Design a protein around this ligand. Structure first.
Ligand SMILES: [Mg+2]
Ligand SMILES: [Mg+2]
Lengths: 51, 112, 52, 187, 129, 175
RNA sequence: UAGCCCUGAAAAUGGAUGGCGCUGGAGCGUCGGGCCCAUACCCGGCCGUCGCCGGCGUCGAGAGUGGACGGGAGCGGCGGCCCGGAGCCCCGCGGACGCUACGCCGCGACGAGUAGGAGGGCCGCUGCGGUGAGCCUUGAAGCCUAGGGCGCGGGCCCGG
RNA sequence: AGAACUGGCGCUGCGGGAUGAACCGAACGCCGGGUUAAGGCGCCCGAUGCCGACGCUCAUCAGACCCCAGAAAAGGUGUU
């Protein structure tokens, strides 16, 4: 017995939706990362434009 | 109530116990439930022919809760890696032996 | 009594085509209801002092 | 530790005969092959009776076999018994039935064959009917033994009917007190 | 390097210390042959800690490794040429012993026969001149 | 209760189940100081069953939420009312503290009733708690810190033993 | 009024929070975070037992959980002068182990024990019937051994 | 000394209670890794060698951890 929640494709032999559940959540927390990294820069860039 | 610890499990407590400590009884033995052919062959009479259809009838208590639960072997859990508090009095009283109603999910994540 | 009011209710749905489920269940956990506290406020009570 | 059982949990049936008869061992190797390979419950009942004791395999008289095969429907089936067929003197005529047994006796197998019958063994039963199809399997009276009428509650118990162990039946041998209302009591 | 068997596994043994009888250190009338002690107050039957361990079925060695010699063969003692030719079809798993009875003249012929059939004998240099 | 760590305030309201005799029971409110929201909804039924004919089988709580302070950064004065049990009898007691927050003053009380009176956390009931102002305080340990331009030094400082080298050639000066 | 300490408070060998000892605690109360370990719990290896079975198909030709033929009509795919029909092993003659069936193989759960009860002994002793074309004066039995090992053990084999 | 209910000891090792029949944890095939239970972590003696938190307490008889192995009424302008 191998461990689902620990290796891929033992999840996917048991639950095929767990792959597209996983790249739908690696995509969106890669774009929420970009949405917050660009927000922290472009706010304090205009702050750096003043002083 | 002196001898058990219980409470109300959430959705990845009921998921972490099936995918990691999940075991079945077809006739009389505990098999590792590796394939969906091990749920469908013994319990596909009830429309619940796979693994997450097994987990849907045990989180939301459905019409076929009795046969899906009695299919699962009782979870042979490890000893808790935090340690227990006092083990002999109630969770209200300071110990941990009773109903804790959602803190049981903090305990499953150390038992499992 | 509930072999009488079961068999007259068994054929009562046979002629009407439903799924009455005449087997009894014990007391279920309570429904997700919605209490009302209309206008007033919940009354504050405190433990009284000790006297003989 | 796990539970508080009394440990029954060793099933106390028989898995092979205690008999060292090599002909009877060949029947077991014939039928424990058939029992695990033919998906019939005839070959599970015949296989578990080849295991059984001489006490649990009682004889069957030739008059019960023709009494239990003059029933409606049984006219062209086979008589199967894992046990011996002694004849009844009491019966007058014999039909032309087809039988199958371990060990039919000498007078009984003369009377079946005069009447046109046919004796089989379990070998040529298996080649005729492997599934056991078209068979009437019978048994003798296993509580027909004299041993079973000493078995019961206790002879002195009221309403017992249990036949005590006496070395000689007669007057003065276990008839005085506890057996009649005059001498003490009746049980 | 002389005559090598088939595949030899690693022989574990669970214990290599030869179960000795209780109170046998203390008396010379008591041999070291294990008898289990059926006394009422003794502390070895009652299995106290730090004392003489008593044998049971848990020490049993692996089924594919039981009765293996440390060379990887499994002995079978012979007496003459004709029951040494019964071992021709087992020469890579089973080996021969010449028994303690067989004289030094007959031992010469059944060790030089096992050279031809390529059967290992564990005592080939016994009772020589 | 054990009163483990810092405590935590809870607003626990609840009503008894609607009978044929009384639809809409009045749904009382309490103020529970407890380590978590399982002991808090347990101690709600300890005090409500002392005052009304309510008990947990014939009642339900409708809200148990953590009420926290509205000024964590403001130094306040908390005088509280107690009902502890002693070895001989039981006593009523007023008792002041002084803390940034409401929930930490009652933590400081259990640490202090156990210290000065050996009173375990089960044999002690909290009647009421409020922030009081200066000139309404009675206790001089609390009153002496009511001092504009308060000043004191730290005499005879000692700390950090064995974390430094356990063997040194240097006698540690206590300032 | 109640926490701690004190008085009340005296026993016979020298002595006992276990001892040494401890007073910004190694004391008492209330608690926090780490950390230490049982034959307990979990995962793994092995032994045995219980349970449930598998394999007579050694069938390199068995191919099979619905298959026939063969007739009256039809579409696809194959080799055309829009008409058409079985090829049965072969260029290699080949293809591991196995099933003491009282034996082999699999899977799962279990394992404390007095009195007591059963099972197995390829444990051991003495004699008898059979049997090893057994074994030996080129050395039997017996006894000795810091010699080589085997079996969970009873014990056994070998070397001198 | 004699009963009731349940568990245990006798028949039972193991961790802890220094010591031990019965207390507390836990029951046991032979071992490796992990984690805990009761109990603990100055040094015997594994682990607080944490920059642990708040208080109380001075004894010329201090106190010190279920069973459990030593105390009462009464009293103190001793301290809180
Ligand atoms: Mg004893
Ligand atoms: Mg208890």
């Amino acid at each position: 017995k191998k461990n689902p929640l620990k290796n891929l494709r033992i999840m996917l032999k048991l639950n095929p939706y767990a792959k597209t559940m996983r790249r739908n959540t690696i995509l969106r927390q890669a774009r929420n990362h970009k949405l917050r990294v660009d927000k922290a820069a472009a706010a304090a860039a205009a702050l750096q434009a003043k002083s | 109530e002196p001898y058990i610890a219980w409470g109300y499990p959430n959705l990845k407590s009921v998921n972490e116990l099936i995918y990691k400590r999940g075991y079945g009884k077809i006739n009389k033995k505990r098999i590792a439930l590796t394939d969906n052919a091990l749920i469908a062959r013994s319990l596909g009479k009830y429309g619940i022919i796979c693994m997450e259809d097994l987990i849907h009838e045990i989180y939301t208590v459905g019409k076929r809760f009795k046969e899906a639960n009695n299919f699962l072997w009782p979870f042979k859990l490890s000893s808790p890696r935090g340690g227990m508090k006092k083990k002999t009095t109630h969770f209200v009283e300071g110990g941990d032996a009773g109903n804790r109603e959602d803190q049981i999910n903090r305990l499953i994540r150390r038992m499992n | 009594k509930r072999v009488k009011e079961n068999d007259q209710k068994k054929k009562e749905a046979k002629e009407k085509g439903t799924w009455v489920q005449l087997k009894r269940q014990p007391a279920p956990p309570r429904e997700a209801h919605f209490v009302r506290t209309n206008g007033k406020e919940p009354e504050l009570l405190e433990p009284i002092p000790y006297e003989f | 530790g796990v539970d508080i059982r009394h440990n029954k949990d060793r099933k106390v049936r028989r898995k092979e005969p205690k008999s060292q008869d090599i002909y009877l061992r060949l029947l077991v190797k014939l039928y424990r092959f058939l029992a695990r390979r033919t998906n019939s419950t005839f070959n599970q009942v015949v296989l578990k009776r080849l295991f059984m004791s001489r006490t649990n395999r009682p004889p069957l008289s030739l008059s019960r076999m023709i009494r239990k095969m003059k029933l409606p429907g049984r006219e062209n089936k086979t008589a199967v018994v894992v046990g011996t067929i002694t004849d009844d003197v009491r019966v007058q005529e014999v039909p032309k039935l087809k039988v199958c047994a371990l060990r039919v006796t000498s007078r009984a197998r003369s009377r079946i064959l005069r009447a046109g019958g046919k004796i089989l063994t379990f070998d040529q039963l298996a080649l005729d009917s492997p599934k056991g199809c078209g068979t009437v399997l019978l048994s003798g009276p296993r509580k027909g033994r004299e041993v079973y009428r000493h078995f019961g509650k206790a002879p002195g118990t009221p309403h017992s009917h249990t036949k005590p162990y006496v070395r000689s039946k007669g007057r003065k041998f276990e008839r005085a007190r506890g057996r009649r209302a005059s001498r003490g009591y009746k049980n | 390097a002389a005559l090598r068997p088939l595949v030899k596994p690693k022989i574990v043994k669970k214990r290599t210390k030869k179960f000795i009888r209780h109170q046998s250190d203390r008396y010379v009338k008591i041999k070291r042959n294990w008898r289990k002690p059926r006394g009422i107050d003794n502390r070895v039957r009652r299995r106290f800690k730090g004392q003489i361990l008593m044998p049971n079925i848990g020490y049993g060695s692996n089924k594919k490794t039981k009765h293996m010699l440390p060379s990887g063969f499994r002995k079978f003692l012979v007496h003459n040429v004709k029951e040494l030719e019964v071992l021709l079809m087992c020469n890579k798993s089973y080996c021969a012993e010449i028994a303690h009875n067989v004289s030094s003249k007959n031992r010469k012929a059944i060790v030089e026969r096992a050279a031809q059939l390529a059967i290992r004998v564990t005592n080939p240099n016994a009772r020589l001149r | 209760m054990k009163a483990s760590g810092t405590l935590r305030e809870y607003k626990v309201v609840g009503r008894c189940l609607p009978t044929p005799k009384c639809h809409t029971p009045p749904l009382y409110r309490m103020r529970i100081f407890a380590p978590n929201h399982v002991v808090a909804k347990s101690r709600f039924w300890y005090f409500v069953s002392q005052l009304k004919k309510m008990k947990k089988s014939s009642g339900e709580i409708v809200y148990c939420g953590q009420v926290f302070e509205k000024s964590p950064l403001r130094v306040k004065n908390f005088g509280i009312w107690l009902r502890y049990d002693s070895r001989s009898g039981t006593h009523n007691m007023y008792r002041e503290y002084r803390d940034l927050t409401t929930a930490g003053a009652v933590t400081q009380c259990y640490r202090d009733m156990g210290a000065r009176h050996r009173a375990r956390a089960h044999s002690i009931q909290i009647m009421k708690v409020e922030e009081i102002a200066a000139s309404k305080c009675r206790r001089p340990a609390v009153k002496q810190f009511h001092d504009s331009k308060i000043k004191f030094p730290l005499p005879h400082r000692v700390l950090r033993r064995q974390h430094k080298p356990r063997f040194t050639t240097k006698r540690p000066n206590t300032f």
